[PDB]
Amino acid sequence: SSKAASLHWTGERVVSVLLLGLLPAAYLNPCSAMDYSLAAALTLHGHWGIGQVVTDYVRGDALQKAAKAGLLALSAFTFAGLCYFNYHDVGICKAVAMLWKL
Amino acid sequence: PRIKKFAIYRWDPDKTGDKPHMQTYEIDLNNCGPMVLDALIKIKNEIDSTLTFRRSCREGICGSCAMNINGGNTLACTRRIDTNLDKVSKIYPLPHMYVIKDLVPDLSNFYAQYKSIEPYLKKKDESQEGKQQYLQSIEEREKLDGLYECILCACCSTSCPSYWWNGDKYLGPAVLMQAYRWMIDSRDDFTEERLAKLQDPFSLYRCHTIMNCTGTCPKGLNPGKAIAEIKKMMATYKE
Amino acid sequence: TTAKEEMERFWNKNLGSNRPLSPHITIYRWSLPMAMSICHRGTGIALSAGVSLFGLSALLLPGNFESHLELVKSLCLGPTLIYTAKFGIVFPLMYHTWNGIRHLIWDLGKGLTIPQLTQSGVVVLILTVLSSVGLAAM
């Protein structure tokens, strides 16, 4: 009797306290390292969040497995795109800053 | 002569081509008891004896007369009729449940879930049982207060939206609370394997603390609280 | 008859019959905590859709971020109207952030009674407006 289901729940809350910790930390300390950590925690937590909606709502055999596959593709693209934005562009912390004073 | 209007859900499976509809009844409160069930029986006895419903104690300790009164899952023998004659009282069967007839739902799945959690005292050594009472201190007993009272009305589980959408695989708060009840019982030795029984995404983990179960409870119990307490144990238990 | 057997036979008799589903959402009463549950899902989905649309367009749409802003600068926007777009971004974010703590306080076990559910309910609701208006002017 493995306990993957329980640990999954713990991860969800550990990334939630991490994400809550990162928003003020991104304000007080905007840097390249913060941009990557904010892209990593942001995409992971969102992935697990939507994952919960799919399991709650989508009733089906090859229906639930398909949506979970499509979500992983969407998240992997989202995280890599954010990483690309951090490396070859301004980066979230210096991007939001520009967007706001406008 | 104070006349009250009752809008009640009606369906006859023994009539062909019949589908869910609403039938209204009129009753004087001077001859009727204070409670909704008193009125339910009154129209059952005097007006229409097709109205088929569950009842027993009329005391609030069976969970027989469990139904959705005015958009709220409570007992009909505990809820008193709104004396306000301007409002029409809407009485419905317990939500998202297969209606057998006229406010009577199929609870057999709900019951089956109660069997799956195994609500009996389990000991590692059942060889010395039946001869001497198990010791339990008043503190160890206090832990069961607010849990053992669950009368299994099933107002609870079927007021949880998550239970409507996941009726088969999600156990529902009523069933879940009792699984907890048997965990903190200082006598029960099987606490770990009872937690290991919930190690899938559906069993307990379709809870998102909606908290619509507690507050509809006709006994003032707090299933939600106990569910969150299960979750804590689920991470803080070793092996 | 086992516990697993009873469920399997439950679904067989009911799905192969003319028994209707008792009205659920059609009739049930509305409560603030449950409305605040729906909103948390609504804001959660909308936010993730924003982040995804931001990350994907960084791969799919040509140009750099500075050129994308000069594209919005040349759109004749007044302070009151740019405040409206600024508000409708923080408004869902702040809701989910504050209510997020309310969910996290719940997971610890604290404040799970009906009074504390409606108390923290209004407190989150007010904190949202104060931080949404308070941020959109920075």
Place this chain on the structure above:
Amino acid sequence: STQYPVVDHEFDAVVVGAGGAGLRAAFGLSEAGFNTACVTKLFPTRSHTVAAQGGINAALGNMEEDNWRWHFYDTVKGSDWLGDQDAIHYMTEQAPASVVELENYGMPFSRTEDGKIYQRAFGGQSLKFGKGGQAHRCCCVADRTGHSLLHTLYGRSLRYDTSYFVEYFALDLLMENGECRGVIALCIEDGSIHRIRARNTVVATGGYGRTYFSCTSAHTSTGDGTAMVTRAGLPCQDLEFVQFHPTGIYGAGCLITEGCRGEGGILINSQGERFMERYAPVAKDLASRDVVSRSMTLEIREGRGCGPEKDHVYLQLHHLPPEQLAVRLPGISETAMIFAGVDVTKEPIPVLPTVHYNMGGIPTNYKGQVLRHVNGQDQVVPGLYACGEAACASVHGANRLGANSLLDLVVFGRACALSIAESCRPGDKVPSIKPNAGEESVMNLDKLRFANGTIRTSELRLSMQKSMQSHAAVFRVGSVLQEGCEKILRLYGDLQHLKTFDRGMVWNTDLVETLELQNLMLCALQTIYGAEARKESRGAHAREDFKERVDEYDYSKPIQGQQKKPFQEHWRKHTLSYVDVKTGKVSLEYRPVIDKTLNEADCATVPPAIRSY
């Protein structure tokens, strides 16, 4: 005919009843390796033992030092010497054993300082054989003993491969030539009729409290097995003996436990005087179920009514500390406010003596075997057992001692299990049922399903209820009993004038409540006729005219040169009632009480004496 699909089932044993006794008999059998089937019209939890509050009696010695034989004396005294002392021996010996079992089963009994089961004072119990003050042996789950009982019995029953027929209304006994072969029952779910045959049949269908207009018992206390036994032509014991619980809400008639009086609660008339100190000097308001309620109902006659109607009495919990009321009695604390609109800690509860328990029922062994009376002699009915409030082993006799029935349930439910297990074997031949078996059980169903009567079912239920409520109250004269008898007799003729409306197979509460009306009437006839016939004041049966306690001897003066009285002259005997179903007449005979115990050396007989608390 053939409109109804007949479906025959095959088992080792059938138990009719999912409340307490029924359950303990059901899984008690399956534990012994029996292919057992349980049949119940309610769901197990919804049964009426859930409505129990007070407790479950066992001399565990968990408060003071105790003896189970002191529990024997108090039960046999309370029974007004109409109790069969052999069964009482058996029940009081198994008392601590059966309760320890339940605590091991999972019953979350309230706890003491020592860490043991919580026992409390209750009406009619004593120490040192009634010579050493009040006894504290009522084991309880803090005001919700019955609830917790029924649940932990059911929760434990899932362990065994018992076939439960949930929501099935048992119609009649599948009888063939003296011996029983099982039960024929209606499936409320889809209207079908099922014949369930077995080698044995346990009956635990509970009381028949709904014979009266006002009762503490649930709507589904219709004494169905009592009628089932009655329609087979088998006698029914002590049916006129009906327990009136002293305390119950003036309104709907819900029970406020006697555990209130055991914790320190007092009864108050219009003056403020503790009147239960005037009637019973020694035991006070902790006396018998019959003595207390009769004192209460007499105080109403005297003009000491308490409410705006001058027809009810008071139960005060105001003076007790709130600390105790929260921990010890929270179930009544809520239901007093819920129904009567009364805060327990500030003002007293309006109470009225109303029907509670039915000590009468199906004549039963100490082993649980159902008894027929032929040639003035006891005889065992093959393949038929009964246990609980439903049955009458008369361990309660003429007046049930408080908090004994939940014991009676467990012990005698268990008894039927061991009496089957230790007699026949599992896998033994199931007797072949008739091809026609129970034609008129169906011919009864079809008659009532299409009923085109001139008088409604519901109004006839009230016609029976109010008639019993006035003609057979706490006090009853031969005047009101004779008129009441020929009044109930007419209301049996009206059973072919009743109108039904619902004509559906699936869930016909119109049909089953009418089937309950056929069952309640058979109980009613046997209750009222036995009452007018019995001319004495024994226990709950108190004649205003024949106010004497008529025994074989006059037990006031010592038995010396006193001559014994013949059997058909004294009234210390069991009332056996028969009823011809067509004519609706009750003919009744009598049978001796058991006076001897099981073992005189270990537990000695206590002979009749002056009975007052």
